[PDB]
Design a binder for this molecule. Structure first.
Ligand SMILES: Nc1ncnc2c1ncn2[C@@H]1O[C@H](CSCC[C@H](N)C(=O)O)[C@@H](O)[C@H]1O
Ligand SMILES: Nc1ncnc2c1ncn2[C@@H]1O[C@H](CSCC[C@H](N)C(=O)O)[C@@H](O)[C@H]1O
Lengths: 206, 206
């Protein structure tokens, strides 16, 4: 897999050089490249942003700068991912689906986001997805791209209820007898039962 | 606010030293500390993990090591956050709620997670929350803690539909006339209408 991440904060993708993703890279499973968007700017101030039409707070990332970056980095086989709290929700199904991709490009937004025409123009050449990692607002798309890449790379590396360990009794808290029993059938049943109960309490949406 | 993050991958929290969170730190809004869990180990191999009771794949993070770290770092006023895909969903309401906290501690899990008794034992002294940032599986809790801290710090710093910018026409794509009109009432109505439509298509759960 080839991954390209475009951002005005390259340092924020440094976790992808560590642990599982860093191991996936050095082992040649993935080619990861992080690009500073300012390298596609030409003005004296190397600016990636401008005032929004119709007003609003903050600034908008300019379509001409993004368009020039994506024209260079993307092909017709690329799956362009635009993190946004207005996108479809990223789930484990999405992470599994992205393992079948040859080229992922992440266009990380800052400020109020990226001029909408970047997505519409990209869609003329390649496949584009606006994706949210959850119902919260982040200052930028970088932490979202780390989350998405780690979820995909975990699956790629693997392809290519409560947990307990010793001691049996700690601070007056004992490991449930079922786990000490060595009876796989009883253990599987209990784990399913506790997971169902926890799901009912915390995640009835599931 | 004081934030403590406990992990076997301190480098993975480096994004919190950049951009908005890094600015919140240097301006004295937040005291952020990242702790390597191995510093609370005493065995020859400085190990934080052991085999799970009842079997299963991988390893479990030991309760005695976590208990010793949390005994040192936490107080009765701490809100202990344990990232887990089995927790309640983190949302913008949670991020807003956490801005009222004086001390957040994030216990980042690796492997199959943290022995469940760590949470139960912590709950004897302080408030604990098991939290998921979404319906996907990450290799570790660090990228989840970055997401949560950034969402909270964005709100803390601020307290203490589609976007467009120039040019009006780009690659044959024009900015909607409504945004060029300068009529706030018409702009607000249109933005609400396009956002509602996008919500119906992508997020009927909302
Ligand atoms: N929940 C989330 N999921 C994925 N990306 C998010 C996110 N929250 C914020 N972001 C990122 O942070 C950037 C700035 S937040 C701007 C939000 C924008 N007005 C919109 O509605 O799209 C976004 O462009 C996106 O890249
Ligand atoms: N969706 C998510 N939200 C928050 N943390 C997650 C997460 N997915 C994985 N993690 C983190 O990654 C670590 C290893 S994943 C292990 C999952 C564990 N068996 C469980 O059901 O809790 C978890 O301990 C947690 O810290």
């Amino acid at each position: 897999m080839r991954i390209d991440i475009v951002t005005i904060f390259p340092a924020c993708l440094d976790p992808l050089r560590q642990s599982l993703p860093g191991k996936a890279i050095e082992s040649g499973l993935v080619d990861l490249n992080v690009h500073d968007l300012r390298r596609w700017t030409h003005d004296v101030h190397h600016s990636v942003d401008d005032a929004p039409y119709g007003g609003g707070p903050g600034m908008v990332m300019k379509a001409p700068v993004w368009g020039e970056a994506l024209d260079e980095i993307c092909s017709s086989e690329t799956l362009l991912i635009v993190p946004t709290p207005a996108g479809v929700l990223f789930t484990q199904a999405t992470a599994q689906r992205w393992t079948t991709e040859s080229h992922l490009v992440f266009a990380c937004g800052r400020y109020e986001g990226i001029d909408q025409r970047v997505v519409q123009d990209a869609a003329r050449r390649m496949r584009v997805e606006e994706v949210s990692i959850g119902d919260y607002v982040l200052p930028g798309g970088e932490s979202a791209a780390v989350v998405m890449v780690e979820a995909v790379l975990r699956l790629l590396a693997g392809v290519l209820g409560p947990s307990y360990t010793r001691p049996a009794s700690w601070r007056g808290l004992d490991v449930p007898e079922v786990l000490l029993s060595g009876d796989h059938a009883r253990i599987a049943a209990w784990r399913r039962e506790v997971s169902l109960q926890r799901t009912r309490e915390r995640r009835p949406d599931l």
